Coordinates of C-alpha atoms and ligand atoms in Angstrom, one line a residue:
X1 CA 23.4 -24.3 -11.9
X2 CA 19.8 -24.2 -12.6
X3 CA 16.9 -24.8 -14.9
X4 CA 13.4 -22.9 -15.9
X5 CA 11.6 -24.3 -18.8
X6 CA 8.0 -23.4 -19.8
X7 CA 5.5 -27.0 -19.9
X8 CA 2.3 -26.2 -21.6
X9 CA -1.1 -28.3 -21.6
X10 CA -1.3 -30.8 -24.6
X11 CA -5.2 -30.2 -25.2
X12 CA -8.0 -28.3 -24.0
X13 CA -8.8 -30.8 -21.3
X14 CA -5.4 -30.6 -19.9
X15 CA -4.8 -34.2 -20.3
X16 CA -1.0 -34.3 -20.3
X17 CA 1.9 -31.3 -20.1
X18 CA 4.6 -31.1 -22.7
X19 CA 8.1 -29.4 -22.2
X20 CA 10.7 -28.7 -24.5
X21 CA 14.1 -31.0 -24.0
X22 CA 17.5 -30.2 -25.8
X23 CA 19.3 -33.8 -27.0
X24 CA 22.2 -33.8 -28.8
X25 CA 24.3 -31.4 -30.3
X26 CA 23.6 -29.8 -31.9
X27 CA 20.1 -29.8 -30.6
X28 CA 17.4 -31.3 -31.5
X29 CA 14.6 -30.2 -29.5
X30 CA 11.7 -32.1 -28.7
X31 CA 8.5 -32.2 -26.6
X32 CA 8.4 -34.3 -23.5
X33 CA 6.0 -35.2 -20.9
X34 CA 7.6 -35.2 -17.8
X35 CA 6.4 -38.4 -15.4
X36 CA 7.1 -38.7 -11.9
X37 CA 5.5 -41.9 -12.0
X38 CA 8.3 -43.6 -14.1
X39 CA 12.1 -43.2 -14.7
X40 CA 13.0 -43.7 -18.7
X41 CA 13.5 -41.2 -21.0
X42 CA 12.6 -43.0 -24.3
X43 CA 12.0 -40.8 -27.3
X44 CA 10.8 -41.0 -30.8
X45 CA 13.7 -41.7 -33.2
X46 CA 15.0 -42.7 -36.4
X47 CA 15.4 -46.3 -35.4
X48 CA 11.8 -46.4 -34.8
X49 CA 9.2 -48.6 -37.2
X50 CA 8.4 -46.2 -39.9
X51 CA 4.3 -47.3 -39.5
X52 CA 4.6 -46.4 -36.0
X53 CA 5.8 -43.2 -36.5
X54 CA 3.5 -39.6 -36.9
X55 CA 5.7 -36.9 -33.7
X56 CA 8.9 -35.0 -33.7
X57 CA 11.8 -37.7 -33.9
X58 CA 15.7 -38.2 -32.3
X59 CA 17.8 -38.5 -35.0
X60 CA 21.2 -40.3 -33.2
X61 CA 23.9 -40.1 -36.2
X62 CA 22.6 -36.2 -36.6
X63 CA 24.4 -36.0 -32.8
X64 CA 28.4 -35.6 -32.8
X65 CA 28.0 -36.3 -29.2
X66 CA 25.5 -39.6 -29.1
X67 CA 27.3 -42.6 -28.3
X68 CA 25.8 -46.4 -28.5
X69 CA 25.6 -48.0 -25.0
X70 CA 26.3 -51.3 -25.9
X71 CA 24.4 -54.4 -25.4
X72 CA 21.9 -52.1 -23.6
X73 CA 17.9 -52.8 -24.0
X74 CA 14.7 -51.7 -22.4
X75 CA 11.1 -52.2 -22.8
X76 CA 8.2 -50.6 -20.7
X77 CA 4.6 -51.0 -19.6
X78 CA 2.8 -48.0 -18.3
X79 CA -0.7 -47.9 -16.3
X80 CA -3.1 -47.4 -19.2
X81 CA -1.2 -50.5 -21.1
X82 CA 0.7 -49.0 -23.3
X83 CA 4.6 -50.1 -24.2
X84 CA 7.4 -49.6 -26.2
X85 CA 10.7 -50.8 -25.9
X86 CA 14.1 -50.1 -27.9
X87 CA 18.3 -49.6 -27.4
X88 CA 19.8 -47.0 -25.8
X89 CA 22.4 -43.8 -26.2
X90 CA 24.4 -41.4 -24.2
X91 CA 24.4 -38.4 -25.4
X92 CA 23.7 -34.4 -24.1
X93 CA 20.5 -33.2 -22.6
X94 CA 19.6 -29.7 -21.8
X95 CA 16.6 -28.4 -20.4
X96 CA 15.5 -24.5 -19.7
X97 CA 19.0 -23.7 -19.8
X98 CA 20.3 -27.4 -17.5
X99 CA 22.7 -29.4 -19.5
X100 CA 23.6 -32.8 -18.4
X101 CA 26.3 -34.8 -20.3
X102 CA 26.2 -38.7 -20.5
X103 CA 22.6 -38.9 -19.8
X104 CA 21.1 -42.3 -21.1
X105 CA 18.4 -41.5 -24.1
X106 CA 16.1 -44.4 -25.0
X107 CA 15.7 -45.4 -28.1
X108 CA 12.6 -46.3 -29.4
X109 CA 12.4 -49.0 -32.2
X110 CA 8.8 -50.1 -31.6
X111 CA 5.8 -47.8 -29.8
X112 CA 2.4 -48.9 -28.9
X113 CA -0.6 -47.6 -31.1
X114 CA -1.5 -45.0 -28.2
X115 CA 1.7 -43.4 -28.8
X116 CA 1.2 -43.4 -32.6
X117 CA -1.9 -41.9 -32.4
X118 CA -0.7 -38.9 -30.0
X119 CA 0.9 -36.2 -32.2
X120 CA 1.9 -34.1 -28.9
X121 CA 4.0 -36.4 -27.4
X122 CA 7.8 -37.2 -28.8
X123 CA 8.7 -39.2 -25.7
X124 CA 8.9 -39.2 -21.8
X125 CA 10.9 -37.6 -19.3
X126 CA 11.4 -39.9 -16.2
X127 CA 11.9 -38.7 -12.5
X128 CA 10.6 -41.3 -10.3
X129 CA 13.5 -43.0 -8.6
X130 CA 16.3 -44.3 -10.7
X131 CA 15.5 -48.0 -9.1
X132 CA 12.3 -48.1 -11.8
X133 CA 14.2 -47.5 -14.4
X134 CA 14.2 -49.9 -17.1
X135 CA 17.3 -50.2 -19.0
X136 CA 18.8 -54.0 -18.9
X137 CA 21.5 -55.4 -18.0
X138 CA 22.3 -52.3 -15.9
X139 CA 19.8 -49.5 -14.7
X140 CA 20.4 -45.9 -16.2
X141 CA 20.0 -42.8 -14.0
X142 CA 16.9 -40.3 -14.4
X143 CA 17.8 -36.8 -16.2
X144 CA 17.3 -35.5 -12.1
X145 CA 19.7 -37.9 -10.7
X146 CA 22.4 -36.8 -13.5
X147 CA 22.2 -33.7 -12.5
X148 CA 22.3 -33.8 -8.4
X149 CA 25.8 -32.9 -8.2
X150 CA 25.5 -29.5 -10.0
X151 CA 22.3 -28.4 -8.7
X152 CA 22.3 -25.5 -6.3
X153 CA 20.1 -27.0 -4.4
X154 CA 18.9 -30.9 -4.9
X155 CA 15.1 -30.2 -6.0
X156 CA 13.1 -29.6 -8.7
X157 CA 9.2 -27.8 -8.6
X158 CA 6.4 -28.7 -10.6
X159 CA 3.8 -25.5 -11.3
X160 CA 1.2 -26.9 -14.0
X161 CA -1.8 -24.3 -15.0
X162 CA -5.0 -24.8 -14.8
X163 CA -5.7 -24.8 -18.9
X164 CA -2.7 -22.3 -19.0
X165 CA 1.5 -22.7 -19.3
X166 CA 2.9 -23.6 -16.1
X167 CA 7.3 -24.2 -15.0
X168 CA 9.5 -26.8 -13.9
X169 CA 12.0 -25.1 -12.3
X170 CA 15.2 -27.8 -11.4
X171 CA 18.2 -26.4 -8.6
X172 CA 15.8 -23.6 -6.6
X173 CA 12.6 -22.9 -5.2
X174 CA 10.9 -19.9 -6.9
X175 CA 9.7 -17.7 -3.5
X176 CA 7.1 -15.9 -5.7
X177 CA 5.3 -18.8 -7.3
X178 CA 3.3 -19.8 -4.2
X179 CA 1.4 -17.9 -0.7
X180 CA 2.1 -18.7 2.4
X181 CA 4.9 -21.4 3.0
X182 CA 5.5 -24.8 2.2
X183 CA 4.6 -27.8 4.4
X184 CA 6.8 -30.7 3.9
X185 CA 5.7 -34.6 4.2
X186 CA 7.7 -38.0 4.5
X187 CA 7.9 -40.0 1.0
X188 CA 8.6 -43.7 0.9
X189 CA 10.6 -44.6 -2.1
X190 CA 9.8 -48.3 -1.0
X191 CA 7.9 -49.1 -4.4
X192 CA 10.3 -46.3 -6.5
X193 CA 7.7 -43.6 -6.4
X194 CA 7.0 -40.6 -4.8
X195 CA 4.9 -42.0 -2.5
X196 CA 3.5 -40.3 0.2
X197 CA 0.8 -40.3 3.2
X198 CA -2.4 -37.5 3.0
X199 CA -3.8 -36.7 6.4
X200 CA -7.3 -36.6 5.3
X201 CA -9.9 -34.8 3.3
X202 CA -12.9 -33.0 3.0
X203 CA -15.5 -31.9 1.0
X204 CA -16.8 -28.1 -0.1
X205 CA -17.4 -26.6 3.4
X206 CA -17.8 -30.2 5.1
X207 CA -15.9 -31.4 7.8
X208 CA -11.9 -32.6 7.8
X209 CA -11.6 -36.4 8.2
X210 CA -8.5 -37.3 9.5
X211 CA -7.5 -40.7 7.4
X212 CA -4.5 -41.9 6.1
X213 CA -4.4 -41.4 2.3
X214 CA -1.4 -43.3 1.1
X215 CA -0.6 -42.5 -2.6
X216 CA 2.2 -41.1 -5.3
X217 CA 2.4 -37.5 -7.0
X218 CA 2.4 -38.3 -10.8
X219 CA 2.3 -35.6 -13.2
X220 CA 2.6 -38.5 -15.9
X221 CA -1.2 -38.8 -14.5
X222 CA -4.1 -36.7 -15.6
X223 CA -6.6 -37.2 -13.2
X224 CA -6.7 -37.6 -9.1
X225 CA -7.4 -41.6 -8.3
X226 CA -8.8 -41.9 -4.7
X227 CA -10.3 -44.7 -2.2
X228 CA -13.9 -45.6 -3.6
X229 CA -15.6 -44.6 -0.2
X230 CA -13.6 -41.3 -0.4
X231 CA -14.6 -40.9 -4.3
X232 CA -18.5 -42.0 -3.1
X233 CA -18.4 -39.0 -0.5
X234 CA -17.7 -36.6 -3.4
X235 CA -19.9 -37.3 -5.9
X236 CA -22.8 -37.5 -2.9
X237 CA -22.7 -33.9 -3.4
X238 CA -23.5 -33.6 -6.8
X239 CA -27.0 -33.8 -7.4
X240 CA -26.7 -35.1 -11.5
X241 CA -23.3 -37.3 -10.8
X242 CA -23.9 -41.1 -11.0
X243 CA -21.0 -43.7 -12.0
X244 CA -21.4 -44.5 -15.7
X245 CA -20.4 -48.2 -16.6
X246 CA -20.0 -47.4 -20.3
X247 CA -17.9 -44.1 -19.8
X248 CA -15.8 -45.7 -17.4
X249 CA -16.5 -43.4 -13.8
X250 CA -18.1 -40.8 -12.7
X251 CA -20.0 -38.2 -15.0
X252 CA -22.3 -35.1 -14.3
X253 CA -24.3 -32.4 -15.8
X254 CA -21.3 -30.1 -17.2
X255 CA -24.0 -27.1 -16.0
X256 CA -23.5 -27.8 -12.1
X257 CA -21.4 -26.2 -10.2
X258 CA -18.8 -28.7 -8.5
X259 CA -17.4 -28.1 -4.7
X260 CA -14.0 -28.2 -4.2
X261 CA -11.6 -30.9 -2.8
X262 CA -9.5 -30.6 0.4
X263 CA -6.6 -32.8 0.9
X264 CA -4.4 -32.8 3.5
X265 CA -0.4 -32.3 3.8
X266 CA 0.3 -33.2 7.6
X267 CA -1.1 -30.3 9.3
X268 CA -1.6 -28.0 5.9
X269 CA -4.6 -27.8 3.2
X270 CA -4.6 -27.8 -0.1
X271 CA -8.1 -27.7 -1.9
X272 CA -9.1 -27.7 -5.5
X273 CA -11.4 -25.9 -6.8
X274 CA -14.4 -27.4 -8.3
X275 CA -13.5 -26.1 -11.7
X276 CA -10.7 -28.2 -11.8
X277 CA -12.6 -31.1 -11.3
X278 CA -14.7 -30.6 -14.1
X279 CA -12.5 -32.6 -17.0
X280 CA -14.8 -31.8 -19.9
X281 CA -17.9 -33.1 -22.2
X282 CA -17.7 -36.8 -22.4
X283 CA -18.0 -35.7 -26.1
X284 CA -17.9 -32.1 -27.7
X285 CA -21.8 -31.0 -27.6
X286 CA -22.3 -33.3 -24.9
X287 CA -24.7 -32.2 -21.5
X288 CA -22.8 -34.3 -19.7
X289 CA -19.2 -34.1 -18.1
X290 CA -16.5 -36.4 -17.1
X291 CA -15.7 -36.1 -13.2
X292 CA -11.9 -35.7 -12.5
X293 CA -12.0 -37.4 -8.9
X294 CA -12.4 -41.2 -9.9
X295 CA -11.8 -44.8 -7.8
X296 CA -8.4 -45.9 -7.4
X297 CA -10.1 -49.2 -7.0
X298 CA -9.3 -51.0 -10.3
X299 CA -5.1 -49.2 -9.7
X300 CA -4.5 -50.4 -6.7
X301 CA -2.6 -47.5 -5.7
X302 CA -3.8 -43.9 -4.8
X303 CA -2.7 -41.6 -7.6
X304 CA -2.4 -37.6 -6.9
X305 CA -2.6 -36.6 -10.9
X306 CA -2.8 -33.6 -12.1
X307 CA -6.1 -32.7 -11.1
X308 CA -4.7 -32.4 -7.5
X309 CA -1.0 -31.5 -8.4
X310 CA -2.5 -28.1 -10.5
X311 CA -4.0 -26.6 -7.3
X312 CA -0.3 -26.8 -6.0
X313 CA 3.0 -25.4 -6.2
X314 CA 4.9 -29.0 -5.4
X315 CA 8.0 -29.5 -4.5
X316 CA 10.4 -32.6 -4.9
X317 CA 13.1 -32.5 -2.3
X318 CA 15.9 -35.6 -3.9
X319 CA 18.0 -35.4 -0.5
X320 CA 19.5 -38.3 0.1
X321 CA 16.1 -38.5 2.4
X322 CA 13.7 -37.4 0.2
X323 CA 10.9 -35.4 1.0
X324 CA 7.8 -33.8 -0.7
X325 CA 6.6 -30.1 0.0
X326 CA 3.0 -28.6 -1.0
X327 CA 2.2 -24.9 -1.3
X328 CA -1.2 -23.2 -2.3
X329 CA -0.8 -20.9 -5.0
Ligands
0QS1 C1 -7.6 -39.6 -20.7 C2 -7.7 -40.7 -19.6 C3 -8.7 -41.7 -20.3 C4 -8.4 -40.1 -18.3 S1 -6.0 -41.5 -19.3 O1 -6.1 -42.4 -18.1 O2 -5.8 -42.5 -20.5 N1 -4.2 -41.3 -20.1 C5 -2.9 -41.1 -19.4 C6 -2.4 -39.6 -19.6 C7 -2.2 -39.3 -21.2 C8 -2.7 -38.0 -21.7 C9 -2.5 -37.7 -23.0 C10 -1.9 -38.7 -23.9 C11 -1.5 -39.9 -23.5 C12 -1.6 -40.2 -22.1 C13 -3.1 -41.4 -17.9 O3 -3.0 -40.5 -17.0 N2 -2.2 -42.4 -17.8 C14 -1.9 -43.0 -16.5 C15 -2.9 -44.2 -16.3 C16 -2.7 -44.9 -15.0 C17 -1.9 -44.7 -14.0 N3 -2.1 -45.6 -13.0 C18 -3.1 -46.4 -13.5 N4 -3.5 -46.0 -14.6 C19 -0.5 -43.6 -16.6 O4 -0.3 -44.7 -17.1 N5 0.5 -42.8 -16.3 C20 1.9 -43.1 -16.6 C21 2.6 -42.1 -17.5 C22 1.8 -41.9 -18.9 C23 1.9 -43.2 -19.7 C24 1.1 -43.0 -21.1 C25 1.8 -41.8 -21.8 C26 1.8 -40.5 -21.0 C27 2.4 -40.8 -19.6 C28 2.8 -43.2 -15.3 O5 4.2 -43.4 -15.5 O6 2.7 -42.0 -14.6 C29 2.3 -44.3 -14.2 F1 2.8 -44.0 -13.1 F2 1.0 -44.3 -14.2 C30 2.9 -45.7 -14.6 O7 2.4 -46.3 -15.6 N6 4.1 -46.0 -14.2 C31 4.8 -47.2 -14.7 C32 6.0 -47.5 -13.7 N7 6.7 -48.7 -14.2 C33 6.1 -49.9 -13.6 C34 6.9 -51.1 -14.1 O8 8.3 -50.9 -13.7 C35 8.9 -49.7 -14.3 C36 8.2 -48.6 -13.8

């Protein structure tokens, strides 16, 4: 079998992509982000704190095929510090046409004020590697690992728009979504992420520097997190860009005219354009623009977000050896 379903930007600034998830039956559809830098899928419910609660909501008793898994908890921390933590169900889960039975649907009973606050979002798809997941006292498989065993093929492609709809396609690779062919690297799954090694980078029309880049693909991340003295070497190039303490990175005068990013896939290219590394006003009106290449400095891990993930057609190969491939597109 195989999935296609349709993930559209959340704002004008393309901070985070939503897709449309089936749970229960009958369903009750909701709007995910889907994060390949975590492995829960929580979701806004009924059991959630009323005052917490604004969002489209999982109603379990609605479900003739939830069930209670119990004695089962979790509780999450992501990046930008927000949490939630709750109990967890089995129950159905279909998306773009890809039902998986049994699949473990987290419960939310308390959300952090981020979450409140973001109308867009009713909860998160995991599909980093099942090992991150963080259901207690035993680990629940991603959505993605469920469904390994009917898949016609073990992958799944992300294809995010530049401020336009984009597809996740699960079980194939779609031939006429990317040009030329698709260049395959190594990924470590050491830390649980899809964490791979760049050969290098390079500026507008500057020169190719061949240095190892070792970082995750997160589409649960909006912008592209580099080594400061790669970052520096961007920004050198823009006349108006200076770092901004009080913004929190790198802004420029939203007139100029950004060059574009190269980074490297073992012996393939993929480069942004500049206009994709223009975020947006700091604040609508504003002359000035927030870049969308900052230091990964304060992360302490290299994060290939959005910004970088857009310019691609990426896919993620869950062999038992996993492996991640990048076409331009
Ligand atoms: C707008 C911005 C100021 C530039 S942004 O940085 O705030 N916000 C989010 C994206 C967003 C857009 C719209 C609404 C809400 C959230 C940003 O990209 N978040 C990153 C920040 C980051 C990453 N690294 C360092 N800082 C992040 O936490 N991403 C996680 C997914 C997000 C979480 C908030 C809600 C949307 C999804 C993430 O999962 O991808 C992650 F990889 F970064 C991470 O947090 N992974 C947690 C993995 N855990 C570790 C503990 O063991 C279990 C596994």
């Amino acid at each position: 079998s195989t999935g296609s379903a349709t993930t559209t930007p959340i704002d004008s600034l393309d901070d985070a992509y939503i897709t449309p998830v089936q749970i229960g039956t009958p369903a009750q559809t909701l709007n995910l982000d889907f994060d390949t830098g975590s492995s829960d899928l929580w979701v806004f419910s009924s059991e959630t704190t009323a005052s917490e609660v604004x969002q489209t909501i999982y109603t379990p008793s609605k479900s003739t095929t939830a069930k209670l898994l119990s004695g089962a908890t979790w509780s999450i921390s992501y990046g930008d510090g927000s949490s939630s933590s709750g109990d967890v169900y089995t129950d159905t889960v279909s998306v773009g046409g890809l039902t998986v039975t049994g699949q473990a649907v987290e419960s939310a009973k308390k959300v952090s004020s981020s979450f409140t606050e973001d109308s867009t979002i009713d909860g998160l798809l995991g599909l980093a590697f099942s090992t991150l997941n963080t259901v207690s006292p035993t680990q629940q498989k991603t959505f993605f690992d469920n469904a390994k065993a009917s898949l016609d093929s073990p992958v799944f492609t992300a294809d995010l728009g530049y401020h336009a709809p984009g597809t996740y396609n699960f079980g194939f690779i779609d031939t006429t979504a990317y040009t030329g062919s698709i260049t395959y690297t190594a990924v470590s799954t050491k830390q649980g992420f899809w964490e791979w090694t760049s050969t290098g980078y390079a500026v507008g029309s500057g020169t190719f520097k061949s240095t190892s880049i070792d970082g995750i693909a997160d589409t649960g991340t909006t912008l592209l997190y580099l080594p400061a003295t790669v970052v520096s070497a961007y920004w050198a190039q823009v006349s108006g860009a200076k770092s901004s303490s009080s913004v929190g990175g790198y802004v420029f005068p939203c007139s100029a005219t950004l060059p574009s990013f190269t980074f490297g896939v073992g012996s393939a290219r993929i480069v942004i354009p500049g206009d994709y590394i223009d975020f947006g006003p700091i604040s609508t009106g504003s002359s000035s623009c927030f870049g969308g290449i900052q230091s990964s400095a304060g992360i302490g891990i290299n994060i290939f977000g959005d910004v970088a993930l857009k310019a691609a057609f990426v896919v993620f190969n869950g062999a038992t050896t996993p492996t991640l491939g990048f076409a331009s597109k």
